[PDB]
Structure 1
Amino acid sequence: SVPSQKTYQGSYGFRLGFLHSGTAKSVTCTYSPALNKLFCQLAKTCPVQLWVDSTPPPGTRVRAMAIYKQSQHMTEVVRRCPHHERCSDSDGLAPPQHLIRVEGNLRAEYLDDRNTFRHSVVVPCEPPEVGSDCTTIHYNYMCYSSCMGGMNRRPILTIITLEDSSGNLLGRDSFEVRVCACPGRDRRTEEENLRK
């Protein structure tokens, strides 16, 4: 009824990482460690790093899913709003209803869960390229947090799960997301509110 959001490194020491993009007015995606919150513009690239301490088996996958953060909305499926689900901006793979897309991975699979109706996007887990220390997935969020009839100003969390080939849990991490016009300014405002 509600997916777990408990952080779980598991046997492979799985966790996320984020770039340090700053808070200039021009920034399109920026992560706040103090808030555990990603701020991004609509349909812009959000790089999310995957870190492990040891190599998981072939066939391991990485799934992303959004849920509402507030308990009174947690059972509602997070989906694109009535406008954006009809705006014909598909990449030829993501269903138009899905909030979260993976950019530039032809092996991405999009699931409409037959029992919970929740949306998710899953890719094969891959090792870092030679010369790199981690692997990065590029996500896009396809509605604003404010979209009426959709998220409608309700905060969401993205849950990233490391899964075996059957879909069993190997690791879990999560972060709040705000999709907004000015992520740099909103990160500064919310960090100031937190300090106050």
Structure 2
Amino acid sequence: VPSQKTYQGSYGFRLGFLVTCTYSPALNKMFCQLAKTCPVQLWVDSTPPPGTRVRAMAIYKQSQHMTEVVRRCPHHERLAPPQHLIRVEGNLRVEYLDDRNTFRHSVVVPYEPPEVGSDCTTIHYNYMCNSSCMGGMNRSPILTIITLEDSSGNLLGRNSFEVRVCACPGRDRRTEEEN
């Protein structure tokens, strides 16, 4: 299984977050609706090298399920391959990748610096299956792992957040925070 370990790296890489999508810092958890815009901010302390790329991948949070590949349920599976949970919208250079050994899916875009008038780079992710989809995530928590990689694919930085894809993000966040 791919590592989830936070690695700020040489460029001081971290994530930020701004109901269709809501983030709980206390839980390090995003709650979002299926197919809706999920803004994830990339923050760096120094400019990454030319051709730096940003990869997103989902894994199960629980150790006992970590070897299982996160993919869309049969119903939802039937630019993006239909099996992929995570898509990117609003980007002309999206790559959908299937690992030849692990079969794990990921979605990659080029790293771009913040637009003029901004301090961070935003990527709009879409999650295409609900956490509750049986025959898929089966209510089991997932993590999204965001990796900053150089042009050769080498690790520059890593961060992660838990995700629940659900009908009522605000309500579920409140419940999970009360728990």
TM-score (norm 2): 0.99
Aligned to 2:153: 167
RMSD, aligned CA: 0.5
Q: Deviations over 1:59-103 (max 9, x none)?
A: 0000000000111110000000000000xxxxxx11000000000
Aligned to 1:68: 60
2:25, 2:33 → 1: CA distance? 18
- Which secondary structure state, in structure 1, belongs to the residue aligned with residue 54 of structure 2? strand
CA shift, 1:39, in A, is: 0.1
CA shift, 1:131, in A, is: 1.1
CA shift, 1:104, in A, is: 1.4
Q: Deviations over 1:6-48 (max 9, x none)?
A: 10110000000000xxxxxxx1100000000000001100000
Identity of aligned residues (%): 97
Deviating above 6 A after TM superposition, structure 1's stretches of 4 or more consecutive aligned residues are: none
1:141, 1:106 → 2: CA distance? 18
- Which secondary structure state, in structure 1, belongs to the residue aligned with residue 157 of structure 2? strand
- Which secondary structure state, in structure 2, belongs to the residue aligned with residue 67 of structure 1? strand
Q: Deviations over 1:135-167 (max 9, x none)?
A: 100000000000010111111000000000111
Q: How many correspondences in the alignment?
A: 179
- Which secondary structure state, in structure 2, belongs to the residue aligned with residue 184 of structure 1? helix
Q: Deviations over 1:101-152 (max 9, x none)?
A: 0001120101000011000000000011111111100000000000010111
Equivalent residue in structure 2 for 1:119, among 73, 91, 105: 105
